[model samples]
Target: TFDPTELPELLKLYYRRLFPYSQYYRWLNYGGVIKNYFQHREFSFTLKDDIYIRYQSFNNQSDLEKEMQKMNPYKIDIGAVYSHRPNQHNTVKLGAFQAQEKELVFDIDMTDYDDVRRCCSSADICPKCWTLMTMAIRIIDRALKEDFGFKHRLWVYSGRRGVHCWVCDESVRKLSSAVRSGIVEYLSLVKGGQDVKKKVHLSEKIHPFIRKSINIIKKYFEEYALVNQDILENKESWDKILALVPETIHDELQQSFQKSHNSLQRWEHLKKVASRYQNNIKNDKYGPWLEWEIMLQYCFPRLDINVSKGINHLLKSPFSVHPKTGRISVPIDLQKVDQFDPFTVPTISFICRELDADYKKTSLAPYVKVFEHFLENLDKSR
Candidate 1:
């Protein structure tokens, strides 16, 4: 347990002692090749009582750390590396301090799936829904690389409730707003607002991209949706799944599902119905393929479009602390993503405790070491 008031002091220690200055420099510097590259980058902070200070620029990582420690912000947000100094936005002429460059980024929040996920909703997360985040990373990471030819994607935990990706390829950073939007539009599948029931709509011939995504979704759908979520157990929830099937078979399947004992068996029955119908009708679009598409629509990634579609969108920094949960926003190890546990992420309070335990105080906390490991790789690449 942590006393909430000590957060400021913990942040002071974190910024002064534990913060990785050199690595932070490497990340934000965006290379000193271009003049005033780091200076043009924007950093924003939320101070005590939700007061936000945006357009903050830094001369270097040390200066950024010092000012952040002084303010002891409740939250820190990383914004675009701009055309002019963000800290001196007032001095710059109108529209001159515009966002010019930033990593191609994506933000996925678990709360967006409240209608589908049974375990948690809106700011609350459990093991069951966390699988969605894992699937999202796998699906998007694949597309970003195999589909787009990007190599330097950095996946990060939001410290609470979501995941963020910073696609750090130099070419990706230089993409325009339209290009960024196009990339996001291609990736976005789960769509529509709260009122729109069936978010993902697929035609008879599924695209190769969706097909590839389904292959990944198939690996997790059975366990995640059928067994773990038990989506078919409740009539209200089951109806949503039923809606995706053909109207001709809906009544029969609904009655059949009533007799079914579990979600897996019910799903198998629905597949059987689709297969049966496949044989009955010649040149029919609705078949086993349609059933699989329905399954994917229910389980595939849901992204925050606004985050990825714009060039100027600000995202929370990787190493910043989540004010509410007290967890440190850490860089995710992609190789070990399946094993990654959001609950296991160390809070600023926990890191301070680790520091206190070290009487000799010769080493950093393991989490900091993990972050450094990521930084070392980045350093090696350069």
Candidate 2:
């Protein structure tokens, strides 16, 4: 039997024996050259008995690892670099624990798509639903580099249902809350509340941003959303797509959909309808552009604005284990986003088993290479 209770022991061994503390230190230390960089950094830990410990700071990486191994925390959250040593905040006068700076981060959870994705709800996720994450990474990573001119960004799996991005450029770290809010709002296209029917509303003259977004969506929308999700097969799913089209064409497409065989055929029918009106006098309202806009509305990246907008928000540390899943929150290489599968991420259980087999052989281990590659990239950036 696969026992989840064995996870704590696995985590203990992982922290003490298996973790790559040296490299982890180098990554977080921000080159160890900046003044008060490590001293002002704040770390929070959730211990075995659900006891929460916060404002934990260390002199160096070794000290941090030593305390972590000693306590074997179930989960860890990384917070802002404060004006003063977070560990000594209590000893100082009131209102001394002031957040100064931290990496600009973004979090995308699968639960946010419960309304869109049909495969699973809440914490449950299948391969079909996993495609959304892949699309998200591509869209965000490109915008971060090309649109914003920021060079250093680290993408990571949340160890469960979503993904995270740590924009580590010095300028990004120094951005004010209002600037962060602007960037997030600019990237966001899919909008509106649960009560609002149409989230993404595109105009006749498609902006380059929406055009680029549609190009990204076109790559995976067929297999992920249409075929796998079968968005046009059911009345509920098909209606969501139809809602994006103007009422004039929506009625005719609804009728054409009944004659359609599958989602592929239904989608083709939509395109055919758009093509018919491509050169019509009323092309302003209905055309291929409108159809493409509808496709993007159904598949574009949906980001959690709160995560990106707030400068003081504490994202889960990159290496921290998800308490429920026991999986390490590892760095993702955007070069191999398609090959990256969250399910294959090494669990605390899996790593311990590997550790058991190769106790003396360090080079042949699994997750060591991931950390090594990430560290090498960090080295290049420095």
Candidate 3:
């Protein structure tokens, strides 16, 4: 419905009319709860032909709105809050220009799943591969709320391929980079990539964090990875799976797989064989790691650790326009996240055409409502 070439025109209408300034301001403003924080936060804008401007800041809603409407940024990135107003860097002492705080953020993209997902390569996603992202959010979202006790997590579609989770609980912002690493480390189970064959290895006793995540993984693994992805259906697909297990189990699976009729039957065969080796921990290299860990490797969330680890790292703001796809970066409704379909998200031109009458009537309205509802909670929680 839209062309990237017409992006500048769509963006003018977007910033002038469709950009949810009040809700957006409330998001970064936090109802003046953290007085100087918003003013000190960094906002970067990328112009047409990729002219980049960083450390843009504002004193209030009008200040930001006025500037954004004028600049008509092709892309907008929100960075960490700082020791002084980001625009006032020249006035401040050299060392004093510090990245004071930022939300504990996570970026899970399809590009990371390149090796396992045969359906599509980097940036290109289909329903078969979309399950990976849905499962990714379910596992990480649960861990954020249950394990850490964070209430306000703003999960957004990055407008094109992946999902971004901004852990906006007030306490989460001030977390040290070390603490942030610990949080991500706990959540990231599927480790390593092409070089090392086995991505996940489990111990006899699993931590409650991982145990709970695996329980969620178990529910989605069969349908999402095994059936839809059909790893055990072919040699090349099953080779990836076989590579993760112990040498003994690998041999057994290799033999059993050749006889299995379908991917489901092959999975069943592996489960039965894995159970036989369950208590053979003394002989097996990774014990019963084959059972759950394989599911983890094939189905687990592949996060960009640098995004979550760095306090000063910038993330695309909610409602920012993706110039390539012409899609609006909308806030995702977590309750309906499992049903969330990335392909169905409204684009800049789609919304532009729909904004003539009541904008609430458009498809974009529901997503905007999700944004508003989160702010309502943030307001009430204050």
Candidate 4:
């Protein structure tokens, strides 16, 4: 158990004893392929009372370990590896320093699914809405691995509310901003802001990429939206859904929705009526895209585009202590992501208490093993 008051002290113990510096070093070193890859990398620290220190580069793993322990930043954000050392920015000629390479990263926040998610909203997540995150990882991982041939994708739980993906494949590390945008645009299905009720407007013919995403999305949509969320169980819920549907289908479902209160049944009935709309056969606007669009609009992953596009953008480092939540930003193992419970992850309070006995006995050890296994596989490739 963690007391919010003990946060400051807990953080000191976490950074000093629990932070896995060896693996962190190996992961960021990139097999030592570059002359100053680790040194030129930027580490920003958000200290207590709103103090922020940026461009704090380090000479080696030990230096990083010691500095992080001494400062014990309230939050740690890892930035890009610059052409010149980020710490020495003032000494360099103006306009000479630039972000050379950084792993292609994606930020997927649960808040983006606010309109569709009935379980929890904003900074909170539950088992029901967590399915969206599961679908997110599956969809993106499948695309990156099969479509782009990218390996070494590290998925980390973003302390609270969301997840972050670091695409660390050799070529992906140096991907230009434009190229990253192309990847993001390809993955993004539901467009427009949350204010826009119905996002995904599917074309008559679905692209292969979209088809694959639907395959991933379909795995959970029935359970997540229909069964768990019960999106069509009420007027406000079903009404919102019907708003996206064609009038012909909407009019028909309005009658049956009252006939039966079951969301699954309502969805099936809507689908049957939607497929039979031959009246809008040639009209692209009124095509048989309502069902597909609904599925996408409800389940597709919403990415923070700016995080992926900017080379110099800073992302919170994996294993960084989340000051607000008292949870470590641990890596998410896709192999066991189905069983992953964000709440079950070790808190700074629990782990610090466990250290008095044996830290390995705490819940954090398994996640550490997951990180180690990932590093082992990555090292094998090198």
Q: Which should have the higher lDDT, number 1 or number 2?
A: 1
- Each candidate: what lDDT? 0.80, 0.79, 0.85, 0.86
Range of the 10 consecutive residues with the lowest summed lDDT in candidate 2:
358-367
Residue pairs clashing, model 4: none
Stretches of candidate 4 off by over 4 Å are 1-4, 279-288, 358-361
* Model 4 lowest lDDT segment of ten: 279-288
lDDT of 1 by residue, 1-382 (tens): 3457877888888777777666678777755667888888888899876789888888877788779778888788888888888888888899666788898889989888887887787989988889999999999999998999887777889988889998877778889989988998889887788877667776677788888988998899888998788898869788987776667878988899989888888988888887766533566544566576576677788888889877878999887888888888888888888988998887888777878763125233444566666556656666
Ranking by lDDT: 4, 3, 1, 2
**Residue 221 alpha-carbon offset, candidate 2, angstroms:** 1.4
For 1-382, candidate 4 gives per-residue lDDT tens digits of 2345676787788888788888899999978978999999999999887689999999999999888889888889999999999999999999999999999999999998888888787788888899888988998989989998987888999988899998887778888999999998888888898567678887667888889898887788888888899999889899989887767657678898899868988888888777776655466344446788889888888899999999999999988878778888999989988888988877788789888863366778888888888888889898
TM-scores of the candidates are: 0.92, 0.91, 0.95, 0.95
Candidate achieving the largest lDDT: 4
Note the residue pairs that clash in candidate 2.
none
Total clashing pairs for each candidate: 1, 0, 0, 0
lDDT of 3 by residue, 1-382 (tens): 2456888888888888778888888899888966797899999999998898999999989999899989899999999999998998999988989998998888888999888888889788888889888888898889888888999989999887799998888889999899999988888877876788888877778789777877888888878777788888799788877776666667888888898788888988888887777445456533345778777887788899989889999999988988888888888899998888888999888888888643465677888899999989888888
